[model samples]
Target: MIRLGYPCENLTLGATTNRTLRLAHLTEERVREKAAENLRDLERILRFNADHGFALFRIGQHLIPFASHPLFPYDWEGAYEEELARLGALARAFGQRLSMHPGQYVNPGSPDPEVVERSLAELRYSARLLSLLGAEDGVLVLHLGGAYGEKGKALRRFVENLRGEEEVLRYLALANDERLWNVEEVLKAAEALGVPVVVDTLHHALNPGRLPLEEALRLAFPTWRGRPKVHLASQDPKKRPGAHAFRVTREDWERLLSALPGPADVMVEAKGKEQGL
Candidate 1:
């Protein structure tokens, strides 16, 4: 069933002044501690929703990097392990859904080989951690790396690069190695160990071909063999001023949702400074 819940940052606890004053009273040390505490609070909210029939709890990169702790020291392994434990505990306690944002650093289809390699490595690491955490069903949401050139050229380059690179293939293989996999490549990799893909409506609109809604569903859900996750975000038509902003239009939602392959979860990935608040 389709489930709805606000992101943790959007919840209101009190009047704006009270919220501001409470925030103002936090010392640097307390502020640092509050990061992890906030996750605990978010978990509680998810629990509340679950009791009320909400099936999924959409999460963001901020919860992984910032809420848990900064990614300083660059020890993704250690950081992942720690966060996995916390997230696992939350999942067990709340019985709600969880997923991740690829964030800016992840660019699966980058023209630059180094960037693409790094992104693949990070994805592999995330898959490993998710398996270890016992959250195999959790989805890793991503954008289809960028194509700075013509749309067709970019798509062709992305496919060719992905096909030729040993590192990319290896990382993707690892994602499926422990039964944790990519949702986008599920059908192609399912026989081996598939991970479900998440389709970001806004991203598809921005890319060339405008990435047809039907095709996106087919790639993401793949004959209903795996779970599908969808991302939705509000866009300002006047600000983006192009086809890219069309994903948030009513027509886009109706068309995309109607063609979904199966039961899915929709996450809000809206923009703006207030997005993380």
Candidate 2:
């Protein structure tokens, strides 16, 4: 049950699920076309993952271009309902666990109310996409975001915003970042929000809390609704502390797998994407 996966791109097939266009140039017709292509590529990637042993995937945020933007005009869920269903069915058949990690702009903890509103809207769109695809167990990963002036208040703000959005909460999970939040801090927030924590190995390596690695995994695993999900990456030697390596090293991967408390799915966060597998 220890499945490994990579984010977004598929190098072998030269396919991607993140095709997008500039906001100013977007038209409903163009968005539909782009979405169609992205969906097709997504299916291709799923099949490739199945053929190999990779059983987990992080779907690209732009799978449906400008999906959460206020200016977005088309009903993508209605337009591409059948396609999403087919993709979901394929994923389930392949025993693949699909997830989506919104970008930094999707921070629910932002002090600006407008930013928070937009973030919630983006989360709603992502959840809707996963639900439509029939991914009953799909997850949406998010970070605790900037602390602004105070970390505690920001965490409270994130929890407060999420309290009213049960729809988004259905697929929500918080991740530990190298700078802002550590495993313990994220776990505390997850407790308040009633969600799972996705422990990033590299993040823990950089900003590890008081808990040892095994102890952190032990605490985080039970928070999950089903099988736990964690992120695996090696720090790039030539870059700053938080930069992920081009490909995860064998030593790093082995070390992480051996430390797991139980069955879990690990997302390979290397810049090489599937090539890191």
Candidate 3:
């Protein structure tokens, strides 16, 4: 069925994922120092993932603080080219699949022009990180942002504005939200833009569409150029609807994989991260 993987942090790995270079304290030296430090952490993370048979991983945000934001004055990408190459090499050596899920603040589909511009900057910055690592087939996973009262127009805006960011969209895959944009809605826009959609089972369960889960993923599968990537996690009983579970149960894991009857790459969105696995 599915190859199980987890997000950025692995509890036992003892590596920090929130290593970022804040703009207020921006200095060429500080930037270099932080980048290198994180690169080392990233190396450890990759090694851990490879050893644990994790084929897919989501490089957490803030890898480079204010990375693409104007506050980040230095050419971190150029400066850290060698380190990034090493990171990419590690993944390639182990045949690991790398990706990124830009955070909620990265909303290019917003109605406000300023928000849209800022989001575009984040989008470009995000794509550049993967490119620097030489992860050719790596994806930049995204979500179609807030509905902004005008659900219909928001969808239209996403499709219209998305095409203009061809550079980032080339390696982009939009994820369906729990309530805002369901699988069917994301599929409609993704097909139009020639982009892939990630069928997150947790989100789908919260916000269902007209199609069945099996058929929904089947429809989304062919949109990608490579093996379809999926996301799954047990629901957090004492937390919010969107909260990731503390641990993935065998029954839940088996149910999820059993539903998807093929070799799909699944990323575990558990709070426990590696230990959660």
Candidate 4:
């Protein structure tokens, strides 16, 4: 049951689910128009993935431009509710699993109050989008924010801030990163928050925790509410340490997949999108 998928884009179809508008050019009409186009393309990609046997996907955050911003006053839920629901039903019908990951700006561990508020807004938007699609098994993945010179304190802050956000917590999952929060660290955080942990293979390769890949998978898989998910990527030899390869190497990919504990979704985090699949 090791299903494969790529994040956000479908290379073969030339479809985009992240059409956006710059702040200076923002307008309600434009927002609606862009969102409509994005949704249409999303449907196209969804069908294409289903046909090609990609049962998992990560929806792009920019599917609705400025969706969580104060300036975005459109009642998108009211306007596009039916269509989104239709898409959700379509996904379920096709046995697809969908997910969303907010950008770096949405950090629950931030010390700044304004940044925390903005993060909450972004989470709300993501939750709303998934709910509209009736993606009951969909997850919203997030990374722990910067340690700000205090890794322990930042982790605690993330849990505490997440406490008040029951709405966001329902769909929440945590991920490991190359710079901070290795697999073991994220597992602890996920346990404290009573959510699942998403292990990124490349992150572990760069900054490993106490456990190795097989043991890490064993521990993280049970935390999931449904079929567990993992991020798979390879280091670009010619690029910086954290850069993902254009396509994951076959030997590396095989090793990662072989360590799977059970049925899980493997989202290929490569630059080649579907080509990487």
What is the C-alpha lDDT profile of model 2 across 206-240, one tens digit per residue?
99979777888999999987999999999899999
Task: Output the lDDT of residue 34, model 1.
Answer: 47
lDDT of 3: 0.81
Give lDDT: candidate 1, residue 259.
70
lDDT of 4 by residue, 1-277 (tens): 6898888877778888888988987889888898998999889988997898889888999898999898896787898899999999989998889999999888878888899889989999998899899988899999997997889888988899898777678899999999988989999999998999998889888888788888888998999878899999988899999899989899877878789879888999999999984
- In model 1, the clashing pairs are 181-195, 182-195, 183-195, 183-196, 183-197, 184-197
- Residue pairs with colliding backbones in model 4 are none
Cα-based TM-score, every candidate:
0.58, 0.97, 0.95, 0.97
What ranking emerges by lDDT with the best candidate at the front?
2, 4, 3, 1
**Candidate 1 local lDDT, 172-235, one digit each (tens):** 3211111122233333432233334555565555442424667766655653334556666545
Model 3: CA > 4 A from native: 21-23
* Model 4 misplacement above 4 A: none
* Model 1 regions more than 4 Å off: 5-8, 13-35, 64-71, 74-86, 108-118, 148-195, 203-219, 241-253, 270-277
Candidate 4 deviation (Cα RMSD): 1.0
lDDT: which candidate is best? 2
